[PDB]
Structures are given as C-alpha cells and as structure tokens.
C-alpha cells in the first residue's frame, strides 16, 4: 500500500495547487520575517528529507535558508575591457542558489557537515531551501551504519569543495558518458572548461 510519505511527495509535485498552495501562502509570511538561516526541529518535506538520508536522531539537524533571487550581483569593470568582458547585467554565477544556500547553512553551524538539501519554494524576491546537517562528533552518529561515513576527516567542510549532491550536479558530474569529458574527475583537472 502507499506510504503516508508518498502523500507529502505528491502534494509537493504541484506546490501551487490544493492545500499546499494555501499552506505556502501562509508560511511564507512568517519565513519572510525570519533570518537567513533558521534551524527547524522538523523537515517541511519529510518524505524528501528521509529520502536524502535524514533520520529522527541525535546529531541530525535541519535548517531553512533563504537567498535573494536572480542573476549575479556584479560590479561593472573599473579598468579597460574588450566589449566581450564589459557585461554586467546578463551575467550569472556558476553556482546555483541551492549551493549558496548549503554553504551559508554550513557556515552557521561550523561543527556540522552538510548531508543534502532540498527546495521549499520561493516568492518573487527569494528562494528557500532546507538543509540537512549532521554532527560528526556525536556518538549516536558515529555508531550509525547509514551515516557514520560522514565522520571521516576527508568529509570535513565537504560542501565547500562541491562534494554535496547539489555540488556534484552543478559540476556536471551527472552523466557518465557523452558530455562529461570536461567535468570528470574535476573541473579543475580539466582546465576549467566544463
């Protein structure tokens, strides 16, 4: 039979219809009055969080982060540039907003490590994502068969090096064949042409 979770999932396929639509209209009013990174005791999208590795356990944290919508907030050149390098308006950054969200969340909790994150909507001027963070120092996690892997030293500050699921996607690592000639094993090893 269908899991209760499937229902949360199905509601979020069309956040603009049904009860969910009404919920968002209500919630966002409060979110707009909240800070940049708000820790929350429970994921707004349980199914999604559990699917990404979330667990109701000690050392598991969830935080919502909001980021301004739009392209790059860039300053026009103050020195000589050929027409090609004078652009300012239509230039966009290479990291998607979800990634910027994961990094701000991780800065807020220096001791925690980003596990994954997912979207929870947006209005006209900002986007919200919830980020799952894990405490690599808590024994309840050090003893977890599904999460202890994130306790290894080489996982420290994983988000800042693009090791996140959103990080790997944004780096063009999804495809294993055609089109990934310059993304794998890293953007840098491939001269930064990916």
């Amino acid at each position: 039979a269908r899991s209760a979770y499937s229902y949360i999932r199905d509601a979020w396929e069309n956040p603009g219809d049904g009860q969910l639509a009404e919920l968002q209209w209500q919630r966002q009013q409060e979110w707009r009055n909240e800070g940049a990174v708000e820790r929350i005791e429970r994921p707004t999208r349980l199914d999604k969080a559990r699917s990404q590795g979330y667990k109701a356990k000690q050392g598991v944290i969830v935080a919502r982060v909001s980021v301004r919508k739009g392209s790059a907030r860039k300053r026009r050149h103050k020195a000589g540039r050929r027409s090609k390098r004078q652009g300012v308006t239509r230039i966009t950054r290479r990291k998607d907003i979800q990634r910027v969200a994961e990094e701000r969340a991780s800065r807020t909790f220096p001791n925690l490590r980003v596990l994954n994150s997912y979207s929870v909507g947006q209005d006209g001027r900002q986007k919200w994502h919830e980020v799952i963070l894990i405490d690599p120092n808590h024994p309840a996690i050090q003893n977890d068969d599904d999460l202890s892997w994130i306790c290894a030293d080489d996982q420290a500050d994983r988000v800042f090096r693009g090791l996140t699921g959103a990080g790997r996607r944004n780096r063009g690592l999804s495809g294993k064949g055609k089109g990934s000639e310059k993304t794998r094993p890293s953007l840098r090893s491939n001269g930064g042409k990916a």
Partner: protein, 119 residues
Amino acid sequence: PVYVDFDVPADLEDDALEALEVARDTGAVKKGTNETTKSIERGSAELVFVAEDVQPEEIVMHIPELADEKGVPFIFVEQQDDLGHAAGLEVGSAAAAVTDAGEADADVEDIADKVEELR
C-alpha cells in the same frame, strides 16, 4: 488547520481518547501516521484520530480526504501528546487509528455518529 474543517468539542474529544485507551487494552489500534494511513487504505480501520497541532501540516493533510473516500470516520484532537498518551505511547502521535475496537464498539460507534452530525 488547513485540513481541519470543523471543531470538535472538548467533551466529545474526552470520550474519544477514552475509547482509544480501552481500545488498545482490549481491541487493536495503530500508532503513527504511516500505520494509520495503511489501515485506511487496507480498510482495516474503524475510527481514525488526527492531532491538530502537527507541524508541518503535510504529514497529515491527506488523512481527511483519504478517509472520506474510504467511509472511514475520523476525529480531531487538540493536543498531539494526548493522542500519543491515549494511544499508550511515551511520545506523541500525529495520527492514530482504531483497528477494530474492543468493548468500546458501542462508544466508538456513537462518537462517529456524533461526528457526522457535527458535519
């Protein structure tokens, strides 16, 4: 709230929890939104309880309509930890379902009746 379409009087709620308490001691009941949901889908549910202080609301938003298209009666409880306590849990419960009561069928039946009446 967005899934709540009627307020259940403190008294009616009092009886329901009692019926649930005797239900677990006698008959059979499910604890947890997932188990509650499968009961309604499997049709093995007679009366389903749904807290009103559930945040996020997505967790139980589906119960109401899923029950109506299953004839299964449902009722709202104000607190979340009461439903859990009445269900015999040391924690809370966003939803519960009486899977075939026990020596409470009469009451469980009336409570349901009083609900339909309450629209």
